[PDB]
């Protein structure tokens, strides 16, 4: 057997200033993702890029400022595709699209893998409730929908009643945090959610951060890993084609190291790469840099090394 990878485009957003994020899937593709995954020796299955259609009204307005029901229903279609990809025996890679798609991927991942854990790499905790933030900011709430302890703080919206909370507070760990709303800070502290801010990373170093993240998640038993990786986790100089750029993020090397440690476990079952928005780039070069970096995270998460040695080499040719 060789390691099998399924790839899904989920070009999901709520429009407004972040409409361009629906072009992230195609941009990551055009930076040569499937070729890189093929060179690794992965058996590949492409579901292509899913339609994102506003319900109940598919007009220009509802496509540029998207009602939340549309985001709820799109995530429900996504969950089933991820659960198909996983039931078929593929580690499932979903290309964003905004971080609201984590509602689809983690729910769908959790169906056949209920004991999964989550490594959330992001500048943001994305844990606001529909009551702590606005109606067009579902990209900043995915985790409130999935977390089990938060059920009584989370109202029932049209398009989101399908969702079964599938993560406990000890089963998610955050890496990269540097932009956290006050209620998000409250939730983290109150419900004991473990997190490594950029300050923690500066103090401990990323090597120790990954050692502690695994101690918390897989310290006692082996469990399927879901990597939810926001490109905005990287410093804005490395990944500028993103919608909420925050100065002081991961360097390229910290980000590859995360991805190498995740690979080295042998337990990566699902991966999101979100928030690549090529229209917010000032130049083609900013667009391509952000898209090349996303490809590097996915490749590295599935066994690309920096020192070579992934593919087996037998002997050297002799002169003649």
């Amino acid at each position, epitope marked *: 057997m060789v390691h099998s990878v399924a790839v899904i485009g989920a*070009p999901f957003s709520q*429009g*407004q*200033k972040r*409409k*361009g994020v*629906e*072009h992230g*899937p*195609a941009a990551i593709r055009e930076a040569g993702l499937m070729k890189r995954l093929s060179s690794l020796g992965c058996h590949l299955k492409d579901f292509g*890029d899913l*339609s*994102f259609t506003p319900v109940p*009204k598919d*007009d*220009l*307005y509802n*496509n*540029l*400022i998207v009602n939340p029901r549309s985001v709820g229903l799109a995530n429900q279609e996504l969950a089933e595709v991820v659960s198909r990809a996983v039931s078929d025996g593929y580690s499932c890679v979903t290309l964003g699209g905004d971080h609201s798609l984590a509602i689809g991927t983690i729910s769908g991942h959790a169906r056949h893998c209920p004991d999964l854990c989550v490594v959330w790499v992001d500048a943001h905790a994305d844990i606001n409730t529909p009551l702590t933030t606005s109606s067009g900011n579902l990209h900043g709430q995915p985790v409130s929908f999935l977390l089990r302890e938060l059920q009584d703080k989370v109202p029932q919206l049209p398009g989101f009643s399908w969702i079964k909370p599938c993560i406990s507070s000890a089963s998610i760990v955050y890496i990269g945090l540097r932009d956290v709303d006050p209620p998000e800070h409250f939730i983290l502290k109150n419900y004991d959610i473990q997190y490594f801010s950029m300050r923690d990373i500066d103090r401990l170093g990323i090597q120790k951060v990954m050692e502690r993240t695994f101690d918390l998640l897989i310290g006692k038993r082996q469990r399927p890993i879901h990597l939810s990786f926001d490109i905005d986790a990287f410093d804005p100089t490395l990944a500028p084609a993103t919608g909420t750029p925050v100065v002081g993020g991961l360097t390229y090397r910290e980000g590859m190291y995360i991805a190498e440690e995740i690979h080295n476990t042998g337990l990566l079952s699902a991966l999101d790469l979100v928030e690549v928005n*090529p*229209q917010l*780039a000032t130049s*083609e070069e900013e*667009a391509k840099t952000t898209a090349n970096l996303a490809v590097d995270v996915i490749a590295s998460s599935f066994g690309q090394t920096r020192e070579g040695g992934h593919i087996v080499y037998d002997q050297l040719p002799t002169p003649s």
Partner: antibody, heavy 113, light 111 residues
Framework: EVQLLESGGGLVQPGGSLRLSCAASGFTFRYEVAAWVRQAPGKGLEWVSAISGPIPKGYYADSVKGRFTISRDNSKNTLYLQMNSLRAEDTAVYYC?????????????WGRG | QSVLTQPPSVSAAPGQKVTISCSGSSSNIGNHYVSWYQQLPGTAPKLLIYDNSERTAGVPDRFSGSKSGTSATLGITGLQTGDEADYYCGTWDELTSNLVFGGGTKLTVLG
């Protein structure tokens, strides 16, 4: 550092066909939502067509649906409007515009017409 | 077009002030953000105002947008002769599923 230039307009007979262009420069139109708006001489502005998302998808006014087709060539960074079964009332100057959203919708860049 | 109502013309002297009303329904201005476009003779419309009162880069504070109920206003103070344009309001209509516009207002600075 950013502009739009239309061409292809002129004189055509009733029941005729005609294709307008709109080349962007200084930005990548591809990742942007684009629109056509028109002005019958000495009158207001009518919205005609819009093209959004990565598929992409086209939206039309009922006064043109089934006669006009909006498209784009990402290679030539150009926006098109194909106009079939044309009528005297279709007589107008035609602008291509960039359509964006924040709280609401707005057209922040217009071509020469 | 002309879902939205504007006056056909307004005038005042240089340095003086004027407002332009934009009148709609519950299904357009009532529930959607108004934008204001300036068109100088023989030129392309330019976005002045969006989301009711957000000025674009370069547009000065003497160009002011406002909105109440189902109506919107464009205030211009300090009138210069370079203000002599046709001005249009615009928004979304959730009745016809159209971007809609007013019929325009010809501004004259009295010389």
């Amino acid at each position: 550092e950013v502009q739009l230039l239309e061409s292809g307009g002129g004189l055509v007979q009733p029941g005729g066909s005609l294709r307008l262009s709109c080349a962007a420069s200084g930005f990548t139109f591809r990742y942007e939502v684009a629109a056509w708006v028109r002005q019958a001489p000495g009158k207001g502005l009518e919205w005609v067509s819009a093209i959004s998302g990565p598929i992409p998808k086209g939206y039309y006014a009922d006064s043109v649906k089934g006669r006009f087709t909006i498209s784009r060539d990402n290679s030539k960074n150009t926006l098109y409007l194909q106009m079939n079964s044309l009528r005297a009332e279709d007589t107008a100057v035609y602008y291509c515009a960039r359509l964006r959203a924040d709280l609401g919708l707005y057209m922040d860049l217009w071509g020469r017409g | 077009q002309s879902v939205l109502t504007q006056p056909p013309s307004v005038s005042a002297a240089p340095g003086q002030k004027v407002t332009i009303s934009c009148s709609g329904s519950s299904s357009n201005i009532g529930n959607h953000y108004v934008s204001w476009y300036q068109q100088l003779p023989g030129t392309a419309p330019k976005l002045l105002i969006y989301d009711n009162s957000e000025r674009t880069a370069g547009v000065p504070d003497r160009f002011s947008g406002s909105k109440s109920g189902t109506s919107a206003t464009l205030g211009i103070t300090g009138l210069q002769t370079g203000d002599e344009a046709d001005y249009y309001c615009g928004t979304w209509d959730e009745l016809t599923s159209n971007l809609v516009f007013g019929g325009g207002t010809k501004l004259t600075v009295l010389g």
